Design a protein around this ligand. Structure first.
Ligand SMILES: Nc1ncnc2c1ncn2[C@@H]1O[C@H](COP(=O)(O)OP(=O)(O)O)[C@@H](O)[C@H]1O
Ligand SMILES: O=C(NC[C@H]1CCCO1)NC1CCCCC1
Ligand SMILES: [Mg+2]
Ligand SMILES: [Zn+2]
Length: 434
């Protein structure tokens, strides 16, 4: 029984009685089994770390774990040191004395080190190779783990050249299985991971689906609304009337944030602005006022840094990216009860956000020259423009983006609930500028 061994270690070392989801459990079992290569794609906070850290302890040899930054290695190392586990790290920030003590440990038979964190630069170093081949010689490597695996991809919004070295490394440790883990969930990033890391076919995939059936999506066009602030007012109120629950209004500028909270409060719905301009004392009062439910609606530019009963998330201005919008809106309806997600689109608004992105990309060019990755920035915005202008199910467009199959829309979107309503609105959009 592996399930005995897993259950024991989850308690005795990690101090958990259960797995956060069955998907975390399914992934973790496949890694223990050790026959296949594995891809774990779950949101940040889902406990991806556990899926390789636990199996490493049940194995005979050493697990090598590649993480992008010494700052994230250190947090991991300290976490595991407070749980009485034999874990070390190899990097520039170590002394030459400590570096000699660790390399000595690796050149014994049956070393004390059980998990070795290393950067991709250090894994691809000249100075590391004798040690690495010595571990290969003596069949002392149980696994190879590549955390933050999206770093291989130009489409993944954090490219790192050194991650492309990890492929050849992988085929040299062919005896041992490889686990690749990320929160970025686009199909192209997954294609890039599979080829860049020379993963072995059939890959066992553990992927959180991005369809939530309890969310209603719609997209209104501001060019067509006679009374914009009142349209929003009614929306907020309807979502709070079955008062009950809370809501979020997102927007881009400080000025619009303030005007929005004034216009909502003046027209029968209590609301307070929330942005980086105001003082940190006043920031935290608005935060606390929304959490304990004195004030039901918060109008914001930026996150706090959980909340179960958000009955609506409204976007006043189009977001910078599809991943952006999916994250932001998806703060709605965590309790499982019906919520509403609305996006107020306009073509002038689209142009403003479009201009800003490109001006930001020019700055990065001035600084470091042209990069293939800047097209990923543009495409990510464009996917959300298409979402706004196309006749189609809302949830499916989201699904298409993250490479999921056609989800069953329970009339859970404006398009599917009434295809012709939406068509009539898209015809009148085009008549506006006739
Ligand atoms: N089975 C579990 N039960 C409860 N909490 C867990 C479990 N597994 C992991 N966690 C916790 O969840 C948090 C997030 O985990 P982490 O591995 O950093 O997530 P990810 O890397 O996917 O973003 C950590 O504090 C971790 O201790
Ligand atoms: O699915 C999520 N989860 C959204 C979470 C992240 C923080 C708040 O919401 N994000 C991932 C990362 C971006 C592309 C693939 C999807
Ligand atoms: Mg992680
Ligand atoms: Zn639909």
């Amino acid at each position: 029984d592996p399930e005995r061994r897993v259950r024991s270690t989850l308690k005795k070392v990690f101090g958990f009685d259960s797995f956060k989801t069955p998907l975390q459990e399914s992934a973790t079992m496949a890694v223990v089994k050790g026959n296949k290569d594995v891809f774990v794609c779950m949101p940040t906070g889902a406990g991806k770390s556990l899926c390789y850290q636990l199996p490493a302890l049940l194995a005979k040899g050493i697990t090598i774990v590649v993480s992008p930054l010494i700052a994230l290695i250190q947090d991991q190392v300290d976490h595991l040191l407070t749980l009485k586990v034999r874990v070390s790290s190899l990097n520039s920030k170590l002394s030459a004395q400590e570096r000699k003590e660790l390399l000595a440990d690796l050149e014994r038979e049956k070393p004390q080190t059980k998990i070795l964190y290393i950067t991709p630069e250090m894994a691809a170093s000249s100075s590391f190779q004798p040690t690495l081949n010595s571990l290969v010689s003596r069949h002392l490597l149980s696994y190879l783990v590549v955390d933050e695996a999206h770093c291989v991809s130009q489409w993944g919004h954090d490219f790192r050249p050194d991650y492309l070295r990890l492929g050849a490394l992988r085929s040299r440790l062919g005896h041992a299985p490889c686990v690749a883990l990320t929160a970025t969930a686009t199909p192209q990033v997954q294609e890039d991971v599979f080829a860049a890391l020379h993963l072995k076919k059939p890959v066992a995939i553990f992927k959180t689906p991005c369809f939530r059936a309890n969310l209603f999506y719609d997209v209104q066009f501001k060019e067509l609304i006679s009374d914009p602030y009142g349209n929003l007012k009614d929306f907020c109120l309807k979502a709070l009337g079955q008062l009950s629950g809370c809501g979020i209004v997102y927007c881009r500028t400080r000025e619009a944030c303030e005007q929005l909270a004034i216009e909502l409060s003046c027209r029968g719905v209590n609301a307070k602005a929330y942005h980086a301009g105001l003082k940190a004392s006043e920031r935290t009062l608005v935060q606390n006022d929304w959490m304990e439910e004195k004030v039901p609606v918060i109008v914001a530019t930026i996150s706090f840094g959980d909340k179960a009963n958000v009955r609506f998330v409204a976007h006043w201005n189009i977001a910078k990216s599809m991943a952006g919008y999916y994250q932001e809106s998806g703060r709605a309806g965590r309790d499982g009860k019906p919520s509403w997600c609305r996006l107020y689109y306009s073509r002038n608004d689209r142009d403003q956000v479009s201009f800003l992105i490109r001006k930001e990309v020019a700055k990065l060019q001035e600084k470091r020259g042209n990069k293939a990755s800047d097209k990923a920035t543009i495409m990510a915005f464009d996917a959300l423009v298409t979402f706004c202008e196309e006749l189609g199910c809302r949830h499916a467009a989201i699904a298409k983006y993250f490479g999921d199959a056609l989800p069953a829309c329970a009339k859970g979107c404006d398009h599917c609930q009434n295809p012709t309503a939406v068509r009539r609105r898209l015809e009148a959009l085009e008549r506006s500028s006739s």
